[PDB]
Design a binder for this molecule. Structure first.
Ligand SMILES: [Cl-]
Ligand SMILES: [Cl-]
Lengths: 490, 162, 490
């Protein structure tokens, strides 16, 4: 068995709902057939946004969306995406159809429809200070000025509100190949000119490390900590060498264990980066923000490698489950995370093909776990069975929240595909006795995936395979499971 | 230095008597007539990153974009090819009076946005030392070697004092 | 009331007994009337060491003793303190008498008699590499060599064993006024030549920071972490300006609150220094060693200021209690601590005047708390009443250990002198029901002290002012108390 105690009366902090965030780009058909179809598309849409996807994302309770993010942030000139949609700039490679039909107004609208927070990354790499400054003016300024007046001409009278503003992305890489020392000087300069207009209050976010560049974190905190509200972090889960990453389906048992081992490395990264932040920011004012994570495979065979289209197995669900747990465990510092990406691109929650769409296993996890959004983390102490071929990994990952309505949610991942997993759970600090419903998400195959032909192969089912002896809750988890139990007091 | 020759920018004073009649099109044409390689140096000192980036787009991009479409309006349908691209010149001097440490950071940044369009493949060249500034060479190699295809060097033969 | 939970089945780590360590110098009558009296002194002694003190320290279960430590370490030439006692070097200032009658042999013998670990600091400041190297040879080498043969002439046949070896002390100050960058280079050099002879295994300790020189810690870990087994830290509790510190007795109520507030700053220091060590030593291989702490007052009026003689109130006991608790809370990294000093000097456990000695309040705490030595820390969660004039301080400090024999010890300090303190304690994770004995240490006056005339004004008494409702333990703590409860299962 695996022993777990849940000190149900010991709150350990708040799980900022923005941990359940997502991110989209203009490299592929993420923002081009996946979401934006156009006001004049045959696919049922709301102001150009297909409703099948809206419905699903609303249901998932998406908390925040990051755009542009990734490389695109530091290529984009935002003025290219405002004004009459008919007469916006148009970049097109015939070997890329960027028509800029989706720009600032369209994005803000989207976030309003979804009821999620907008998170925008301005352009440091190839942009100017005035350019970025003007973007914030354009969006947030209630008064009279060229930018604000232009916002109104373009059809939005009142300013918008925006919190999360990224001052560049990927600046160590495709955003300028900058040294930390150098990005830090630019960050300080740029952020100076991003003002709080009206009663908008900006959460300024500096580009943080790639993977284990602890040097980057050290320098940014040493040089810029006073001038930032948050610091980002980027880590993808890659089974193989960068030159041959491995496939999304039809992969070996080795590729399963290695994929999860890579995913769990997130804990080490977050710990070690947090450690450094602690040195320069002991009271943890500054948010850690993991605005790029998720699996990165080779593209489905016979698709363009540059379009990054990949499938989504039960494997992908385990990664998502375990990684979210890791963020939970670190919610004292980690306050936002953004999986890559939203639609048709890398570890997406949704895939589309014409008017057909499906929910990926990854969707099901975000939907199942939304009970943790803005919940309270509970003191849980545990001893877990090892699994995997060297006893490398934990068989089980588990987390406990207390929703606002008093209810208790306990999520559990079984990482062994080969066999189920026993879990005795002692609950201390209770009031009455408690009753318990349960959902589980599992699969027959190791690469269990949803297709457009069979889109329901892998979906949540009821879970009843557990006894609850008023105090102890012994539970019997399926192989490759992700499971949420809901306890009501009395 | 592009667009209708008759309506291009004009600096003139003999207290620069430049009419911009010779610009990008004229130069690329020249290299075609001579059968020689073109080698262009972009503007780091007083230029921007988008400016330099767009220059390469304008010249080498086969697709449809503001810059490429503008090349065609200006009378060249197909893109040109270019290998040798210098990311600034004389940056220790009349090109910004930069420390090496500093030019290197700009070099890295600028070169990032100079893309290979069509089957054009760029040979990116960083501004190297004046004469015996071995320090400059040391720093540029230490900080930027991975991001450059070549490094420049400048030495004139001067008989007397400057 | 103050709520406390004790997850009695959740071990958080081991409290290294060396946390209960002490330190003495050739400073006043610490080594000269306090401990060493000489073979033919009228004070009853064992090979020159007074038995009243031996007896009391054996009782207290002193785990480790550090000598020379402080400034003296980096002035001492150890060869001056070996050889026929009759013909050893002799330094005398007539304005202070060093006869070197207490040297290496005498010290090693002392540690054998006490059953405590020896901890020696070699001389970096004014010493040489061969000098320090030879000291270790002399002590630990079983074979045939000038140093080992000299040990035997001087009357010790077999080598001794020693773990804890400090490679300089106070090197930022009276040990060379060194930059960290510089001490680190010397540390690396010196430690190179300190060899493990026979099956002796050295625990090499580098001189760490004074108070909040986080820079020092950063540099030493960055440059020398691989070459050290431990790193030291020094913080004294000083009520007033360095020029006018305040007295040991007859002090204001303000001086009480300020004294405790200064003492508690230890938690910040240990946290922030640990934070930095975590960055360069994530697995916490390297011990943090707080080898100088304790109150520092003005000397008792009309005694030599250079001798540092000070009294010891219930206040001093509170500081000792609370500081030890802080070390408990940090036993993942902190593995040794050494209060300054042992006898007649600063915050001593014992004072002497000829053949008369007394136990200070500080002694009583070390004796009462020895139940924590090499014990296991238990998960305790608490919500405590504030006290003090601004609500500054916690009314209560509390800690829980599990002794080897299964028994559970809970120590509690009430920092309010003005009123007692209520404490509800819930005990989870138990098997049987439990019974509970109790000791407390308190006083009538805020400066309650022991004198040679009345040496028992302030001593442990039985404590019975608590009800134990076989699960909850409600307790009623005296003003200015230090209290230990012992629970037996069944
Ligand atoms: Cl929130
Ligand atoms: Cl030990």
């Amino acid at each position: 068995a695996s022993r777990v105690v849940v000190n149900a009366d010991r709150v350990k902090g708040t799980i900022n709902r923005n941990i359940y965030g997502h991110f989209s780009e203009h490299l592929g058909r993420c923002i081009y057939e996946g979401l934006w179809v156009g006001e004049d598309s045959p696919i049922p849409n709301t102001n150009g946004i297909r409703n099948d996807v809206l419905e699903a994302l609303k249901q998932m309770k998406i908390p925040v969306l990051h755009w542009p993010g990734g490389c695109f942030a530091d290529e984009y000139h935002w003025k290219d995406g405002v004004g009459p949609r008919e007469k916006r700039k148009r970049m097109v490679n015939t070997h890329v159809i960027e028509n800029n039909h989706f720009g600032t107004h369209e994005f803000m609208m989207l976030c309003e429809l979804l009821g999620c927070e907008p998170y925008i990354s301005g352009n440091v790499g190839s942009g100017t200070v005035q350019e970025m400054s003007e973007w914030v003016e354009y969006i947030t300024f209630d008064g009279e000025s060229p930018m604000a007046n232009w916002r109104r001409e373009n059809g939005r009278e009142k300013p918008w509100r925006i919190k999360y503003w990224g001052v560049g992305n990927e600046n160590w890489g495709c955003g300028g190949n900058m040294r930390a020392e150098y990005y830090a000087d630019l960050y300080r300069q740029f952020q100076t000119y991003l003002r709080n207009y009206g009663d908008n209050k900006l959460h300024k976010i500096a580009c943080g490390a790639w993977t284990a560049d602890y040097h980057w974190t050290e320098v940014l905190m040493k040089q810029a900590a006073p001038f930032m509200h948050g610091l980002s972090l980027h880590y993808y889960t890659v089974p193989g060498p960068w030159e041959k990453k491995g496939p999304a389906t039809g992969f070996t048992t080795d590729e399963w264990w290695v994929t999860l081992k890579k995913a769990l490395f997130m804990d080490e990264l977050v710990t070690k980066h947090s450690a450094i932040m602690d040195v320069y920011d002991p009271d943890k004012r500054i948010d850690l923000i993991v605005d790029e994570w998720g699996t990165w495979y080779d593209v489905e065979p016979g698709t363009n490698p540059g379009f990054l289209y990949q499938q989504n197995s039960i494997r992908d669900a385990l990664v998502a489950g375990a990684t979210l747990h890791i963020f939970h465990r670190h919610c004292d510092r980690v306050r936002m995370a953004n999986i890559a990406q939203l639609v048709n691109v890398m570890q997406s929650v949704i895939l589309t093909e014409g008017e057909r769409m499906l929910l990926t296993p990854t969707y099901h996890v975000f939907n199942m776990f939304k009970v943790h959004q803005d919940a309270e983390l509970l003191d849980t102490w545990e001893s877990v069975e090892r699994t995997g071929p060297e006893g490398e990994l934990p068989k089980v990952s588990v987390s406990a929240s207390r929703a606002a309505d008093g209810k208790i949610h306990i999520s559990l991942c079984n990482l062994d595909f080969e066999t189920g997993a026993s879990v005795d759970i002692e609950l201390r600090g209770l009031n009455g006795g408690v009753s318990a419903t349960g959902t589980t998400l599992t699969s027959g195959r190791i690469d269990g995936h949803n297709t457009f032909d069979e889109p329901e192969r892998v979906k949540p089912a009821p879970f009843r395979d557990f006894k609850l002896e008023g105090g102890h809750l012994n539970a019997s988890l399926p192989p490759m499971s992700v499971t949420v139990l809901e306890l009501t007091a009395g």
